[PDB]
């Protein structure tokens, strides 16, 4: 390692290198193996319907032009060498905005091997679209994907595959999403046909199951508590008009306020969610409580109060428990 022979070798690897031409131009296609090391998934936004992903993206191919003899060890060159080499035109099809980290330097790896093999690594943060089905929200289970494709070259010129097969993607255990948990992940390889031709594609899919604890602590519990507060009106004597109507008006106002607060933090989807069904059920329950008091007031003075009051007291908890049981069995 006199360090001048290395410079000569690297120089004559270049000096006749055309970056405009892929390896084996006009020959068989270049096989580019790919592997990913996931660092984290920072965000999963229902409003924007996308997720942010940070990863180490490693591509691996062979270029006979970059073959050297002599030096029997792998050359870990400076990342700037990547500017003077052909690299695959890989891109993420469903990305919305992505960048390569650039502090302190451009986070790039170039590693050559004596047989012309090239290992090219990047550190990429990317926001990727993920259409979500919120019909069963918040007891929903989403499928998100990252689609890797060649922009310029068809299958006649380039081919993609996963290095190590199912072991190509690592770091799935590193994900720490407070709202979600990754049930499963999958790798797929295929060819997609366009007007211009057939292009390679790789797909990395994740299945995310949402955690229900936050919505138990936020949505369901206040609704149940307000419904019970509505039930409290039945125990008060019938003659207390102000006391008995106050409970009804505050229950319905609180339920509507909960509805607005809940619906003003999600996309304006046109269909009904599970949370909407439960919320409307609780609303009609407090509504029936208020109308029960109104009907009693109409019956007694201004037209048995004890019998109907006792019947309401025994039946309302039973009916609400039955409704909750039916709902929770339906959505679980």
């Amino acid at each position, epitope marked *: 390692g006199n360090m001048s022979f290395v410079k000569e070798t690297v120089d004559k690897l270049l000096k006749g290198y055309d970056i405009r031409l892929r390896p084996d131009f006009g020959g068989p296609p270049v096989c580019v193996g790919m592997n990913i090391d996931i660092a984290s998934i920072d965000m999963v936004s229902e409003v924007n319907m996308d997720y942010t992903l940070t990863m180490y993206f490693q591509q691996y191919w062979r270029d006979k032009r970059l073959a050297y003899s002599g030096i029997p060890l792998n050359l870990t060159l400076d990342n700037r060498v990547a500017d003077q080499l052909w690299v695959p035109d890989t891109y993420f*099809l*469903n990305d919305k905005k992505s960048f390569v980290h650039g502090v302190t330097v451009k986070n790039r790896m170039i590693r050559l091997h004596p047989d012309g093999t090239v290992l090219y690594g990047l550190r990429i943060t990317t926001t990727a679209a993920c*259409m979500m*089905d919120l019909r069963r929200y918040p007891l929903d289970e989403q*499928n998100c*994907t990252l*689609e890797i494709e060649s922009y310029g070259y068809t299958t006649d010129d380039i081919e993609f595959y996963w290095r190590g097969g199912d072991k190509a993607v690592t770091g799935v255990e590193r994900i720490e999403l407070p709202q979600f948990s990754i049930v499963e992940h999958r790798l797929v390889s295929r*060819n*997609v*046909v*366009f*007007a211009t031709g057939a*292009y390679p*594609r790789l*797909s990395l899919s994740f299945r995310l199951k949402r955690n229900i604890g936050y919505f138990i602590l936020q949505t369901y519990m206040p609704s149940i508590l307000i419904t019970i507060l509505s039930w409290v009106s039945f125990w008060i004597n019938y003659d207390a008009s102000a006391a008995r109507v106050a409970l009804g008006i505050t229950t319905v106002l609180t339920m509507t306020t909960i509805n607005t607060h809940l619906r003003e933090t999600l996309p304006k989807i046109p269909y009904v969610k599970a949370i909407d069904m439960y919320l409307m059920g609780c609303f009609v329950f407090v509504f029936l409580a208020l109308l029960e008091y109104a009907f009693v007031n109409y019956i007694f003075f201004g037209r048995d109060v004890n019998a109907i009051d006792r019947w309401s007291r025994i039946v309302f908890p039973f009916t609400f428990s039955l409704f909750n049981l039916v709902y929770w069995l339906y959505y679980v």
Partner: nanobody, 108 residues
Framework: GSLRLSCAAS????????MGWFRQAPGKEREFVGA????????SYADSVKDRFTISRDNAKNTVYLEMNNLKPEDTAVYYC??????????????????WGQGTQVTV
């Protein structure tokens, strides 16, 4: 000649929004008849069958209806319905479609 084919889909219909009708004549290559989107029914047609065949989406029974008008003898073939993923590219290419129906024969 007022055939109204109906393709019913079950399962993970969300992951495969676009639906498409294909036609295979006796001893001839599969060809693209039409395509319908998800939640809005934005429709695309082949040049041969424009303004003669129509496709509609229900989104309640999860069915797609292909209504056939101005029938011709050349419209004698096996008709399939197939689903396509969100990122597959191209409507006219059968290989982009993942799932296929058995096929209904039409001789009228």
């Amino acid at each position: 000649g007022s055939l109204r084919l109906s393709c019913a889909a079950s399962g993970h219909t969300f992951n495969y929004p676009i639906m498409g009708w294909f036609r295979q004549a006796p001893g001839k290559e599969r060809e693209f008849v039409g395509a319908i989107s998800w939640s809005g029914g934005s429709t695309s047609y082949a040049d041969s069958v424009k303004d003669r065949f129509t496709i509609s989406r229900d989104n309640a029974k999860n069915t797609v209806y292909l209504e056939m008008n101005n029938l011709k003898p050349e419209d004698t073939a096996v008709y399939y319905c197939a689903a396509k993923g969100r990122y597959s590219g191209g409507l006219y290419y059968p290989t982009n479609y993942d799932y296929w129906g058995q096929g209904t024969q039409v001789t009228v």
